[PDB]
Amino acid sequence: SKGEELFTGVVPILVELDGDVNGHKFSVRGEGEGDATNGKLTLKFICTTGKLPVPWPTLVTTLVQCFSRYPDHMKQHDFFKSAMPEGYVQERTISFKDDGTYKTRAEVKFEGDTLVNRIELKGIDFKEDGNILGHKLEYNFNSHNVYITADKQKNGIKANFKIRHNVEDGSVQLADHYQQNTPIGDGPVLLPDNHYLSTQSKLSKDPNEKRDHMVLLEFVTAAGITLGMD
Amino acid sequence: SKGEELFTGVVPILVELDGDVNGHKFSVRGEGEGDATNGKLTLKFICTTGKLPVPWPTLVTTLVQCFSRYPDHMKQHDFFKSAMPEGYVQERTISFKDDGTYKTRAEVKFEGDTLVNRIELKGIDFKEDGNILGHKLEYNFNSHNVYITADKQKNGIKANFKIRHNVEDGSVQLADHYQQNTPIGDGPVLLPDNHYLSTQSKLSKDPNEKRDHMVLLEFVTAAGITLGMDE
């Protein structure tokens, strides 16, 4: 298509969101650039009314699928770029389990040289105790909290946490871990008070490696214990 | 309690795993280095007996929490470094829902200068049609598929997908997404055969930005259609 030719290079992006969640009105502005040749987006978003009343992760999918990399044998299936530069409307209903709902209406157009995503958002029926208005969602997507407790009868520690592996069909494969650590030597060990480990893992592959392999990068920090009149 | 002193610098890591899942024996070796000062690990793992009979993401938790960064006011709660260099035994039971069960016994200790994680794993009761032995697990944790289908009545598409936001207490906040796109223009558009966009996002913060903000990095690739008959 001809609209495809507008994404041959790097295209500046402007996002403008105006939202209203349970009466709390807010606005977001974002700026950055997209590179459909590699399917890469870089964006910075700013709340321009003060503090966001909902967590940032719940707004990621609302804040430009025309920057997807379509492999060559699929270029004829790229609805998104084919609609440019006049653009497309994008409507969504986002239903949070046991909580409120976002309704979403964006226009994704070209304004001059710039790809613009201009959104209205309306969230209703959110629970003030819930995970959204109560601000309980982790910020990085892959952050798992591993809650550690001491077990003085065993001279060690215990933990139990859930990993929910993404399944290729959009399903999830739950993995329920029960952990038990005990010292190998008979010297003294620090048994802890209740805290947790915030863990992040990034998996990747080395394309120059013939063997079945995993390249893993991990960031782990302990949390859950604050200062107490120090 | 003098064990934290062994983790002040960068420490070479050796990981060795002997496994048996539904009678398939395998072995993994892992090499790399850990930096407890920053809570950082970089490791490369190689299946040394051919192909791995399970998805790599199911082995990650099995394959060294003594490299976590304990803030200064908590160093008194660091069991893992405290048990060093004799080390600790780590036993787990991993229960895959509607599927089998891993049991793991590892010994994490210092052999010479190197921190060695030495595991024995046993998995029983796995379904051959299941997500594990059937290798249906995404490799990257933040990879989501946005499933796309044509809606020719409105001259556009329609998409559907789920996002599972992690909650601080360890549960998950599910978000069902129902998407509809139509063109603004009057010109002609491509209507697609069913496919999906494979989407990944990384979120971060500018420490020097005083306003409430989000810095976002995204990688999206259409997939789910294959080359036809040709060469």
GROMACS .gro file of N, CA and C in nm, chain A residues 60-66 79-80 87-94 103-109 117-120, chain B residues 146 148 157 159 161 177-184 197:
model
  126
   60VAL      N    1  -0.062   0.148   2.927
   60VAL     CA    2   0.031   0.120   2.818
   60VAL      C    3  -0.043   0.084   2.690
   61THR      N    4  -0.135  -0.012   2.696
   61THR     CA    5  -0.200  -0.048   2.571
   61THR      C    6  -0.291   0.061   2.516
   62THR      N    7  -0.333   0.159   2.597
   62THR     CA    8  -0.416   0.265   2.541
   62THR      C    9  -0.331   0.371   2.472
   63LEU      N   10  -0.214   0.402   2.528
   63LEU     CA   11  -0.123   0.499   2.470
   63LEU      C   12  -0.055   0.441   2.347
   64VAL      N   13  -0.027   0.249   1.915
   64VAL     CA   14   0.003   0.296   1.779
   64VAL      C   15   0.055   0.178   1.698
   65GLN      N   16  -0.032   0.079   1.680
   65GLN     CA   17   0.004  -0.047   1.616
   65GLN      C   18   0.043  -0.031   1.470
   66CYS      N   19   0.037   0.090   1.414
   66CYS     CA   20   0.090   0.108   1.280
   66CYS      C   21   0.243   0.100   1.276
   79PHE      N   22  -0.336  -0.370   0.799
   79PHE     CA   23  -0.446  -0.275   0.796
   79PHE      C   24  -0.398  -0.138   0.841
   80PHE      N   25  -0.313  -0.136   0.944
   80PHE     CA   26  -0.282  -0.013   1.014
   80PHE      C   27  -0.219   0.091   0.922
   87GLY      N   28  -0.577   0.787   0.846
   87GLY     CA   29  -0.574   0.725   0.977
   87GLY      C   30  -0.692   0.634   1.008
   88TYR      N   31  -0.693   0.586   1.132
   88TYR     CA   32  -0.799   0.498   1.179
   88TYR      C   33  -0.848   0.540   1.317
   89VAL      N   34  -0.973   0.506   1.347
   89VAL     CA   35  -1.026   0.511   1.483
   89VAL      C   36  -0.990   0.382   1.554
   90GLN      N   37  -0.953   0.391   1.681
   90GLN     CA   38  -0.928   0.272   1.762
   90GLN      C   39  -1.015   0.279   1.886
   91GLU      N   40  -1.112   0.188   1.895
   91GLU     CA   41  -1.197   0.178   2.013
   91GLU      C   42  -1.159   0.053   2.092
   92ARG      N   43  -1.172   0.062   2.224
   92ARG     CA   44  -1.144  -0.050   2.312
   92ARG      C   45  -1.238  -0.049   2.431
   93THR      N   46  -1.268  -0.168   2.481
   93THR     CA   47  -1.320  -0.189   2.615
   93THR      C   48  -1.214  -0.270   2.688
   94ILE      N   49  -1.166  -0.219   2.801
   94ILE     CA   50  -1.070  -0.291   2.884
   94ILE      C   51  -1.139  -0.324   3.016
  103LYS      N   52  -1.330   0.246   2.888
  103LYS     CA   53  -1.370   0.260   2.749
  103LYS      C   54  -1.282   0.366   2.684
  104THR      N   55  -1.244   0.341   2.559
  104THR     CA   56  -1.133   0.407   2.493
  104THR      C   57  -1.172   0.441   2.350
  105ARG      N   58  -1.144   0.564   2.308
  105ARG     CA   59  -1.164   0.604   2.170
  105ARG      C   60  -1.049   0.695   2.129
  106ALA      N   61  -0.964   0.647   2.038
  106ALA     CA   62  -0.850   0.720   1.987
  106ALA      C   63  -0.864   0.740   1.837
  107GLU      N   64  -0.804   0.847   1.787
  107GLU     CA   65  -0.781   0.867   1.645
  107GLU      C   66  -0.631   0.865   1.622
  108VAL      N   67  -0.586   0.777   1.535
  108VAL     CA   68  -0.445   0.766   1.497
  108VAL      C   69  -0.432   0.818   1.354
  109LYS      N   70  -0.376   0.938   1.338
  109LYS     CA   71  -0.362   1.008   1.210
  109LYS      C   72  -0.218   1.053   1.189
  117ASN      N   73  -0.148   1.013   1.811
  117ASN     CA   74  -0.245   0.925   1.876
  117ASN      C   75  -0.319   1.006   1.982
  118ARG      N   76  -0.442   1.044   1.952
  118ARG     CA   77  -0.518   1.137   2.035
  118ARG      C   78  -0.640   1.064   2.091
  119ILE      N   79  -0.641   1.046   2.223
  119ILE     CA   80  -0.726   0.949   2.291
  119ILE      C   81  -0.821   1.018   2.387
  120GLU      N   82  -0.942   0.965   2.398
  120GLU     CA   83  -1.029   0.991   2.513
  120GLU      C   84  -1.049   0.861   2.590
  376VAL      N   85  -0.139  -1.006   2.027
  376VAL     CA   86  -0.263  -0.933   2.002
  376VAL      C   87  -0.327  -0.998   1.879
  378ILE      N   88  -0.563  -1.068   1.575
  378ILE     CA   89  -0.630  -0.978   1.482
  378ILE      C   90  -0.714  -1.058   1.383
  387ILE      N   91  -1.067  -0.395   1.136
  387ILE     CA   92  -1.026  -0.514   1.208
  387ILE      C   93  -1.091  -0.516   1.345
  389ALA      N   94  -0.977  -0.704   1.742
  389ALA     CA   95  -0.869  -0.772   1.809
  389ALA      C   96  -0.912  -0.804   1.951
  391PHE      N   97  -0.724  -0.968   2.332
  391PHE     CA   98  -0.607  -1.021   2.403
  391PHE      C   99  -0.621  -0.992   2.552
  407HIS      N  100  -0.905  -0.723   2.691
  407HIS     CA  101  -0.902  -0.617   2.592
  407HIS      C  102  -0.988  -0.655   2.472
  408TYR      N  103  -1.084  -0.570   2.439
  408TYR     CA  104  -1.168  -0.587   2.320
  408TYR      C  105  -1.152  -0.464   2.232
  409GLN      N  106  -1.088  -0.482   2.116
  409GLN     CA  107  -1.048  -0.374   2.027
  409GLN      C  108  -1.124  -0.377   1.895
  410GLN      N  109  -1.162  -0.258   1.846
  410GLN     CA  110  -1.222  -0.242   1.714
  410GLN      C  111  -1.157  -0.122   1.645
  411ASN      N  112  -1.110  -0.142   1.522
  411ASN     CA  113  -1.049  -0.037   1.441
  411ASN      C  114  -1.125  -0.024   1.309
  412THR      N  115  -1.153   0.099   1.269
  412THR     CA  116  -1.213   0.130   1.140
  412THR      C  117  -1.134   0.245   1.080
  413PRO      N  118  -1.137   0.262   0.948
  413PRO     CA  119  -1.062   0.373   0.889
  413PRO      C  120  -1.136   0.504   0.903
  414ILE      N  121  -1.058   0.612   0.909
  414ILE     CA  122  -1.114   0.747   0.897
  414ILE      C  123  -1.138   0.784   0.751
  427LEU      N  124  -0.006  -0.983   1.642
  427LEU     CA  125   0.110  -0.898   1.666
  427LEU      C  126   0.176  -0.947   1.793
   0.00000   0.00000   0.00000
